[PDB]
Amino acid sequence: QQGGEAAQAEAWEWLAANQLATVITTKESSATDEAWRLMISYLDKYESKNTLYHHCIINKLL
Amino acid sequence: MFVARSIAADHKDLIHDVSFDFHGRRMATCSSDQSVKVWDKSENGNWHCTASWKTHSGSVWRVTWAHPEFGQVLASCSFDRTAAVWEEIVGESNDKLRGQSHWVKRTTLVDSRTSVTDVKFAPKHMGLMLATCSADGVVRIYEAPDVMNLSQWSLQHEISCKLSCSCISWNPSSSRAHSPMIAVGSDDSSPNIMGKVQIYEYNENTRKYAKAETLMSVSDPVHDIAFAPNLGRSFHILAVATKDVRIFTMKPLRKELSSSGGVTKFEIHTVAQFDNHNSQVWRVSWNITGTVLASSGDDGTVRLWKANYMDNWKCIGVLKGDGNPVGNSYQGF
Amino acid sequence: MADKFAAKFVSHKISRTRWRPVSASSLQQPDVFATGSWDNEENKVCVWATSDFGATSLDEEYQGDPKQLCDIKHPGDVMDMQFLDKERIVTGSSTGTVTIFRHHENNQTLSVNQRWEQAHYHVGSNMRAPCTAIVCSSPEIVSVGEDGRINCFRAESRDVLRTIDDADSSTMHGVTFLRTTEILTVNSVGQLKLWDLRKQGNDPTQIFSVTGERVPLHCVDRHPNQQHVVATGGQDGMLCIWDVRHGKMPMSLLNAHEAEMWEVHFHPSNPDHLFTCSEDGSLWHWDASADSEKPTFLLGGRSTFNISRSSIAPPNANQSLACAWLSTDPTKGQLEITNLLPSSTLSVNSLDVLGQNLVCGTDAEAIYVTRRLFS
């Protein structure tokens, strides 16, 4: 989020290693949307009944 | 040169709008008859009642078509607190056979409990969204992810637009260095309130719409609001319809260097203001090239305004639905 | 040089080649294509596949190959065969029968759908006749023949929907769209005739012939730079160009040859280059302008006697140049047709050009193709 073109270009190197390809992107794939959908997927698969990890990321954000 | 009849279609009620194909030949009438009538201009041109099916409850004010890359899909609004979505799907493989057609509600956005004052799809360059506004002062912003995945609709965004929403407008945008904006004309009545029209932008780093502007000047319930088609036009213009006619030019004078977004520095001129309709002006309709504007009001007349080589503006047509307009006209200085 | 050809000795005679369509609008070579027999082993229609474009195809002989897929045999020669849509096929029979298939590319078969068993015929002898030209704009279908009848059909019917008969009809050579529902032909009298699909009657709808050596015009086509201006070729060797949708007038009378223009066809990637095929014993690529001062496709080919690739350009400072198009008075000169003969070739009866790509099947028992028409 703080970086830019070099950041997203490098980040794709490990986004591919995390293997996300499904779902159409608009106006070409952007690492931002890539990470957002990645985290959403991590959520919807591993779902704790108490928003534990919601809290975790929120607190790192703060 | 087509003489006018008062004879109307079999709609036993007020006819609200008619929507035409963004690729041609196809039209449809929406009315208070609650039945949506799809007409098709034949090769001879004869348009006949090719389809008619119920779509809503209450007065179905507006039908909006979407380009077939959206699918052959349509939105519609009525007194049902919701917005209905129909794509026409047919059977079989169209090679030299034409099977049976069928109207499909992909979705209907419940839109909380608020009456959809306006609703329409989203522009190409920003992905495929759709916007709904209501007299709640709240604008809901729904999303369909994938191409075969149409029926599903998730409120991607919402913009709270102070007074009750009446008329909405998308900003044309086709540059990555440009941003999508929305103008909102309010039909609430408050002479006190200036800026009855509110303007929001997508600041991309914030990932979010902020208020770009208001028209601190406007205290008149806005009938309709209409961006001028501006994509090669290096600034923007706005047509604003109430009892009078407002035309504004918005030029990026400062685009910021490290503080862009929130508000960006634009000169706004009231480059035109007219009461020539001599009555309340309901709608202004743009030419798709963004060079022509039509204007109608209660007197059932339409005045037709263009820009010159000084870009200033003249009425080049005056069309009467309460009478018979006169012929040609041309002039210079 | 001009991108030499791949020649595949197919050991087969060719009459009709027509791209397998996908309608709408796209640039690729239809890899799939249906072929009507000149005489392959019998008269038949075969399915054939071509490794499109120099990209992903420089192999399977030298520069690609078409391959036989299946075939089904057909009474009466396939003089003409046009496609209603992606896989519905309409061919004329020398038996005077209109034949429509639905192709099965996956099953590699052709389905015998619809037959108008009845067609153009001779009177006073009670003999059958083939069809001169089929016209396919989906799904409306037009047929025209030697005797001069008019055969108007909606798709999918085994009985005549209409045959316009006249107190005046003649032999017909070539047809073309003028508009969506307007049609022109060149005839065997030196006759330019017009019709509208909706309005017809008795005796030809419109008839034309004028000064300028009216000769039996054999081939007509609408330009790859515009349709309502068309070009026709006939006996005299002069090409006649016209602008219509209800009235004729000459763009040009180009003295492009001294003898019959049997068939002419149009360059897609170059809306101003042409090709001509002729069973006078030759086949020419036609090019704008003349002279060897520009790359000569006037004597190009013929194995030896080759000449092309000459150029010079004025910088427009103190230099001036003028050409023929800038004159509007009729009777222009030759415009660069080159006949080509690799080592030996027989009657080439079908050819196709898509972009700068070209295919052609022949009576030379082989196929000739090029990726590029120039260099």
| Structure tokens given for B19 | 């929507």
Q: Which amino acid is at C98?
A: V
Q: β-strands C121-122, C127-128: how paired?
A: antiparallel
Phi and psi, residue B117, nearest 5°: -65, -40
| CA proximity to C335, closest of C242, C272, C263, C270 | C272
- Answer for the pair B54, B35: CB distance below 8 angstroms, yes or no: yes
Please report the residues numbered 69 through 88 in chain C whose beta carbons come closer than 8 angstroms to any beta carbon of chain B: 84-88
- Answer for the pair C48, C68: CB distance below 8 angstroms, yes or no: yes
Q: Is the dihedral of CA B91, B95, B98, B103 positive or negative?
A: positive
Distance to chain A for B290, nearest Cα, Å? 25
Q: Which amino acid is at B123?
A: P
| CA proximity to C177, closest of C144, C216, C221, C209 | C221
N-to-C CA span, chain A: 14
| Structure tokens given for C257 | 């040859």
Residue B273's CB is within 10 A of a number of other CB atoms, namely: 11
Chain B residue with minimum CA distance to A29: B127
Q: A5-17 and A31-45 are packed helices; what angle lies between their axes, rounded to 10 degrees?
A: 40
| CA proximity to B133, closest of B111, B156, B102 | B111
Cβ neighbours for C255, distance < 8 A, ≥ 6 positions apart: C237, C238, C331, C332, C333, C334
Distance to chain B for C102, nearest Cα, Å? 10
In angstroms, the CA B51 to CA B30 distance is 12
**Resolution of the experimental model, in Å, one decimal:** 8.1
- Answer for the pair C135, C183: CB distance below 8 angstroms, yes or no: yes
* Residues of chain C found within 8 Å of residue B95, distances taken between Cβ atoms: 85-88
Please report the residues numbered 186 through 225 in chain B whose beta carbons come closer than 8 angstroms to any beta carbon of chain A: 207
- Answer for the pair A35, A15: CB distance below 8 angstroms, yes or no: yes
Phi and psi, residue B303, nearest 5°: -115, 145
| Structure tokens given for C179 | 């508009």
In angstroms, the CA A7 to CA B6 distance is 66
Question: What is the number of CB-based contacts under 8 A between chain B and chain C?
Answer: 11
8 Å CB contact of A23 and B145: yes
Q: What is the 3-state secondary structure (H, E, C) of chain B?
A: CCCCCCCCCCCCCCEEEEEECCCCCEEEEEECCCEEEEEECCCCCCCEEEEEEECCCCCCCEEEECCHHHCCEEEEECCCCCEEEEEEEECCCCCCCCCCEEEEEEEEECCCCCCEEEEEECCCECECEEEEEECCCEEEEEECCCCCCCCCCEEEEEEECCCCCCEEEECCCCCCCCCCEEEEECCCCCCCCCCCEEEEEEECCCCEEEEEEECCCCCCCCCEEEECCCCCCCCEEEEEECCCEEEEEEEEEECCCCCCCCCCEEEEEEEEEECCCCCCEEEEEECCCCCEEEEEECCCEEEEEEECCCCCEEEEEEEECCCCCCCCCCCCC
In angstroms, the CA A41 to CA A14 distance is 16
* Apex A46 CA angle, A42 and A47, nearest 5: 115
- The shortest CB-CB distance from A27 to any of B127, B147, B207 is to B127
The DSSP 8-state label assigned to residue C305 in this structure reads: S
In angstroms, the CA C352 to CA C320 distance is 38
Place of tokens 């190959």: C65
* Residues of chain A found within 8 Å of residue B144, distances taken between Cβ atoms: none
Cβ neighbours for B240, distance < 8 A, ≥ 6 positions apart: B185, B197, B215, B218, B222, B225, B226, B246, B247, B248, B284
- Answer for the pair C109, C160: CB distance below 8 angstroms, yes or no: no
SS3 C122: strand
DSSP secondary structure string for all residues of C133-146: EEEEETTEEEEEET
| Structure tokens given for A21 | 């390809």
| Structure tokens given for A12 | 């794709």
- Answer for the pair C98, C137: CB distance below 8 angstroms, yes or no: no
Q: Is the previous residue joined to C250 through a cis bond, with omega within 30 degrees of 0?
A: no
Name the β-bridge partners of C252. Answer: C241
| Structure tokens given for C348 | 């080439």
DSSP secondary structure string for all residues of C348-375: EEEEEEETTEEEEEESSSSEEEES-S--
C142 CB near a chain B CB, below 8 Å? no
**Most distant CA pair in chain C, distance:** 72
In angstroms, the CA B261 to CA A38 distance is 28
In angstroms, the CA C276 to CA C299 distance is 14
SS3 C341: coil
Cβ neighbours for B276, distance < 8 A, ≥ 6 positions apart: B245, B303, B315
Touch C-B: 3+ C-beta pairs under 8 A = yes
A24 CB near a chain B CB, below 8 Å? yes
Distance to chain A for B123, nearest Cα, Å? 12
* Apex B65 CA angle, B60 and B69, nearest 5: 150
Phi and psi, residue B70, nearest 5°: -75, 0
* Residues of chain B found within 8 Å of residue A26, distances taken between Cβ atoms: 126-128
